[PDB]
Symmetry: D2
């Protein structure tokens, strides 16, 4: 076993760190002066443009698919660097990557050739969005006997018709609410949407994923794709994650990602499980930022006393705790992503690992930010330090990308309950 | 022992509820439109007026001084209710109550009579403020060998001259930066401001407390009292705790609160400790709102499944933990304030009860809010629910009124270390 | 609201402290040489004998019923003092109280007189035991469509026939495995035990509580009542709580506590809800023993340093956390028992309060002892200190009297889920 | 980076499991019948004899020094497997390792040849010990101004004389109280044992390590070396860790490990930082044992209900948290031992890593066992399950090998306070 980093891993770090310091630090001045989420999002476009220019969107796509992603570790290193400085635009890069996952993971080169084209070109500002979450929630979307997704699709001739609403999917509306360049819309298949899901058919066999470009939207009546709102968020105040209403929305069959049923469900599950492992890099960034800021403070400031604040035991205790939290977190992300990349390991193992990582790193990041604030004291509470931003931004991570309570612990529980569950397969083998 | 609320106590709850509901719920519409801390604070004035019109400022003064304060239990019941609904204005009430504290506590009836008058009148918008905190902080203000407080007063003729900077103290600059109607300004006595504190004389013996009114401010050069900044706070976005510079500031010797040194120190210590017991009501209030909103949602939303979300063991586990934290908190405040009121107990015992209370209640209310957010999931993160505000507001408590790490844990540590410490004296007597 | 103790409450403490110091401290010398639970239990007999002679068994019975219990707070104070010193015997006393409760709560004066007789006589060493728990568990004993209690009863002639097994019930075997002087056996009614419980009937309507005395056991064949084992416990090594089998065990109809069904279930629930509020004082005793021994140590040992170990912040923080946990715990227990005695409040409010209290006090007591051990350091690990005893002892409390995870938190969830749940009823009325 | 295990590492696992399964499972039948610590320890000899025959002692010594240690990761794996079945004898192996370390790490070949010879022979039952700990404790042994170690050495002519007491060092008195085969007695240099350590010499300059064999003891007077008593411990009841008095104890100059002062201290600091990393494996083994026992239980027992107890969310949560603690810990330990093996990194980076690892793993292993118990419920409290043994054994870990509170957090805090502290050197290089 080996923890040393390769030159390209060390270079990716230099690269991202450079891009955040020289480019993203300037982001704040443009967005702050806007009135709402949408405007704050729009004011980000130049910085997303610059990330495309730096090859960061191309780096969200595997090399064999023409992208430049070298490994999921490389990715982990890059995301931590971005988020330790500015979660604005950074968040848009990762929402795009999630939007690309269902295509990256489908086993179909002509779909991948087509839809991945803009995102690997090194130009424009193409966005992507995995449109899953809904106003009524999704933690139970696969419960047998329940509602199921309220966004439904049905086949009508040689095209599909979507009906219902999505909430929260980042980038869904694109820069101008004429849609994301590529959006994967997850649907429950139902003939008559005014009839409830059959309580006797396993909801997993009823899942469809329809791709929706700006063109699909243009080829529809203006009212079939309505944007009802844009939630005002506590943190990450520059992302966009609109409310959206499909009313008789027509989608070409050439746009269906795969045969409906368990294969579609499985792609979504595989897409969300991989980001689940990556989200921890995001969390580690925000919390690294809190720790480092607090560290520096405790080492230069006596707070009215004779010695530096770090020389008090309880102040040290907090910084110790934050540090352990960060270290263990980054170790677990690296373990998780490496596990997803091991071809010899059963999926359940890869899934169990990814949930742990998402659960631990995200829960523990919050703790870390708060402790850092406590060590610093009253000064952390004012907007001339980072913490007020960091406080709101960190609280997103345990709730999003599938909440820990409702989704992540549930998926893990399920795997642990199976007869053939091997707790240490990721570490010791079968 | 008995926990039953008397009629007067039940009416103070009713009254406080009815005030928050019909008056404080309208605050947000005014301040939401403002563009910075101070503007936000000013747009609060009409609401402070109402609080005076309901005698809520008058209730901050004990009856022996012509106020309406029935007891510290009443007080706790009042603050909790106010803060459950809206901390704006409500924070100004407590800051003004803090400001009055050392006058209320001193041995001088004629000083009391003179300075309390506007606050027991039932008219206008009288603000008070206890000015202790400084830019270089204060957890060590009494460390023998330390720079001490950097706000110093010397005697010149029959007036005192203040030099130095204050940060944080709520209401210090009044509604209009012409100052509070009463401001206890805490100073270190130093004949030479530019010399360091004599490392040989116990810092406690150098404390003077000087009363500064709006009048005192007018009868001085405009550049002797200057407001340098208003910190943009993470939560409590409508308070004012500005950065004040005293350069050559003249204060009548008549306005000296008491004999400098041990007595002055004793007044500050007794004020801050008292408020430290009451701060928990503020914490409980805020946490209570997080919990209630979360419970109501938990009991009425199925989140896309077949049962209310509260039928999920993990959800209920959060709510239970929240409820537990709240019940234990309040009990501890009541025990606390009662203790401060029992004249048969030594001061060190009360000090211990008050430190405990502040530490537990405020640490635990943060946890309470976060768990409640985790229970509601993703929705808790949009500003169409109360949590974003609460998250921000709740992080003030362990930090403010003497942070738990620097001060409260230290004061409590000092007490337990004393040879005649009696851990249970507050329950079992001596 | 009032927290001051009465003269009779102070007497209860002194009386309990004195009993503990003078009597219970001599027990370790007797039980230490015994080589199994039972022998350790039997060696405890002369200490229970003294506890009776001191009127402590009489003080488990309310006054109208011919006993000397003055209030539940008195009870709480007493038990805390007892468990602060020595769980041996003390556990036997409260276990007897438990065993007596169904009879105390039932509203049948002639049953009480007969069965409560020896426990108020102040002579001998009468044991009572509430026999509920079973080899197979009990967290789900009320689950409709589940197996239900495996101890079942049927009527035949004018007597009831019990079959099945009990496990864990304290004192159930008496001193000599010929039975407790009074055992309350909780049975599920079933005419044919070979048949599973009917999944279409609500399990609570099949509950029966059968009084079993030493004489009852004498009237049966030898293999109708069999002790099959004595669990060796991690801590509380002097208590007895054996594995009993009933085989065609005959019990007279007169010995049935009340009519089978919801009335009998209600007696069982009421009993355990009451014990659940009191168990905290047991938890407080142990945790206090830990806290005190650490405090004394931390104030008189420099651990090779130049100052007392309490002077180091990390140490003080531990002890601070211990104190807070203990203060809050005792506050909650007192609240809980007051609530139980408040006649103007609905059972569901009382239940919730009790569940809350058992959960908090027992979870928190454990952290308190571990923190105590941490502060003291390595020395806490050796049996010339109390900590090894306390560590094993405190771990019992979250597990026993109905575990927090399986039972307590479930009963509390059920109540909070109820449509007409008043979370603050116990505090602010209805 | 890479997590895959090599053939030799998996064989090391296989081999440690088989040894634990076929040999260590048999220890308890011998040591359970015994009366005190020492006898229990002595009943352990045939199993240590079997350990030596399997080459497990030889594996504690690096290959360049005649032993068969392959790497520290190998070592981590071995310890985990051992401690997951039986810490008896296992504890003796790692104590011997710790005892051999300072000979292993000094750069003096003739000492290495002479004193390591028996431990690499694969023959007999040789024991070693690192005698550092003392009655008055040691957490402050390097504090400038303090009394320092109380075991002192003075040079008299051509030999060294030892005056003072040691407590706790495992194996220190050998099998028969005629001494460990190798003792590294850590002393403070003082010509006059009666003189307090000079408050003006940096204590690290006065440290000496003297090597004591069974021969050194035979060549001394009978009462120069007295075993004053064997502490009766909470868990790990089969280890020996005597109270030892050196009175005028004569040691050959050639048995002096290195030059007194910074060199000697450095050897001690290094030995202990290394074990600090390894110790985590021990904590993982214990905690894993708890976790696996609870997991199997939950996956197969319904506790009187209709579904396996793992189907309940509160049970699943506990096991998830357990799992997450175990996973992160192993990762951290492997990261630690790896960091220690890196020659490119500075000592302070390695020490900060080792400190982190000891703290996290030992703290968190406790929470793991206790959560495991609460999952299982009542049944974990009886000795027919592993849990009682585990609870006691797991509380050893945050306290021992230099407790987390007094030593480990202080060593770490010191590192972080330094001007040139790089938090992430071990991850992202210097
Ligand atoms: C910045 C940001 C970016 C986002 N990007 C995307 C995106 O790219 N794509 C996308 O699809 N969505 C996106 N969303 C939504 C995000 O992925 C959410 O996590 C998603 O909405 C799921 O919400 P939830 O986990 O709170 O579950 P919800 O269904 O909303 O339930 C909320 C809570 O109810 C409880 N609960 C419900 N059911 C159960 C149960 N079965 N067992 C136990 N507890 C239960 C839990 O406490 C849970 O936390 C984004 C949101 C944000 C803020
Ligand atoms: C809404 C609001 C209202 C306020 N109202 C008032 C008011 O009315 N009057 C007033 O005076 N101030 C007021 N302030 C400030 C408030 O009282 C703060 O608690 C005060 O500034 C103390 O800050 P601090 O506790 O962080 O200690 P600081 O002195 O600022 O120290 C900062 C941190 O350093 C560490 N530290 C420093 N010394 C030690 C030590 N010796 N041991 C261990 N750790 C140490 C601690 O972690 C501490 O938290 C207000 C602030 C706000 C936000
Ligand atoms: C099974 C077992 C095996 C052992 N094997 C060995 C061995 O092989 N070799 C050996 O030398 N010893 C051995 N010991 C002892 C072990 O190394 C202990 O960790 C050591 O005795 C130091 O204990 P301590 O950390 O509690 O320090 P102590 O000095 O005993 O301190 C006690 C407590 O005081 C407090 N404290 C003291 N100073 C400070 C301070 N500066 N700041 C904050 N808090 C402070 C801390 O809370 C600390 O926990 C063994 C013990 C056991 C149980
Ligand atoms: C000193 C002592 C005295 C005792 N005295 C008595 C006595 O007087 N009378 C008596 O009857 N017993 C007595 N016992 C036993 C005691 O009351 C136990 O608490 C009782 O056996 C219940 O066990 P349990 O709570 O672990 O539930 P179990 O039914 O054994 O459940 C075990 C575990 O499974 C899980 N679980 C089970 N069901 C659920 C669920 N549906 N939801 C979530 N999790 C679940 C939980 O983790 C739970 O902790 C005594 C024991 C001791 C040690």
């Amino acid at each position: 076993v080996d923890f040393k980093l390769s030159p390209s891993q060390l270079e990716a770090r230099r690269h991202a760190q450079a891009f955040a310091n020289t480019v993203l630090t300037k982001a704040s001045a443009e967005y702050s002066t806007q009135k709402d989420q949408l405007s704050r999002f729009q004011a980000t476009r130049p910085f997303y443009r610059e990330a495309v220019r730096h090859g960061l969107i191309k780096a969200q796509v595997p090399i064999p698919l023409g992208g430049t992603m070298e490994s999921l570790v490389h990715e982990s290193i890059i995301l931590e660097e971005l988020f330790a400085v500015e979660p604005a635009t950074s968040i848009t890069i990762v929402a795009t990557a999630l939007g690309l996952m269902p295509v990256i993971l489908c086993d179909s080169p002509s779909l991948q050739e087509k839809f991945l084209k803009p995102f690997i070109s090194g130009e424009g500002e193409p966005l992507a969005s995995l449109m899953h979450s809904e106003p009524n929630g999704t933690a139970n979307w696969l419960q047998k006997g329940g509602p199921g997704l309220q966004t439904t699709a049905r086949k009508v001739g040689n095209e599909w018709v979507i009906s219902g609403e999505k909430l929260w999917p980042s980038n869904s509306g694109g820069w101008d609410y004429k849609g994301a360049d590529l959006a994967c819309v997850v649907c429950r298949v139902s003939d008559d949407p005014s009839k409830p899901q059959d309580p006797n058919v396993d909801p997993a066999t009823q899942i469809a994923v329809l791709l929706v470009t700006r063109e699909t939207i243009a080829n529809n009546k203006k009212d079939a794709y309505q944007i009802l709102g844009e939630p005002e968020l506590a943190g990450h105040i520059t992302t966009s994650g609109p409310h959206t209403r499909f009313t008789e929305f027509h989608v070409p069959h050439e746009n269906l990602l795969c045969t409906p049923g368990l294969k579609a469900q499985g792609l979504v599950e595989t897409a969300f499980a991989m980001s689940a492992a990556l989200v921890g890099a995001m969390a580690i960034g925000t919390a690294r930022a809190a720790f480092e800021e607090a560290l520096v403070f405790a080492k230069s400031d006596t707070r009215g006393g004779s010695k530096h604040i770090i020389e008090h035991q309880s102040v040290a205790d907090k910084l110790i705790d934050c540090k352990i939290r960060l270290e263990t977190s980054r170790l677990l992300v690296w373990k998780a992503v490496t596990t997803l990349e091991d071809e010899a390991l059963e999926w359940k193992v890869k899934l169990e690992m990814a949930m742990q990582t998402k659960i631990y790193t995200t829960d523990v990041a919050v703790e870390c930010v708060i402790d850092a604030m406590k060590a610093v004291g009253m000064k952390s509470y004012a907007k001339d330090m980072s913490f007020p931003r960091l406080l709101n931004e960190v609280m997103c991570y345990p709730l999003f990308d599938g909440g820990n309570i409702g989704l992540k612990r549930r998926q893990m529980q399920r795997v642990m309950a199976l007869e053939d569950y091997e707790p240490w397969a990721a570490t010791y083998g079968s």
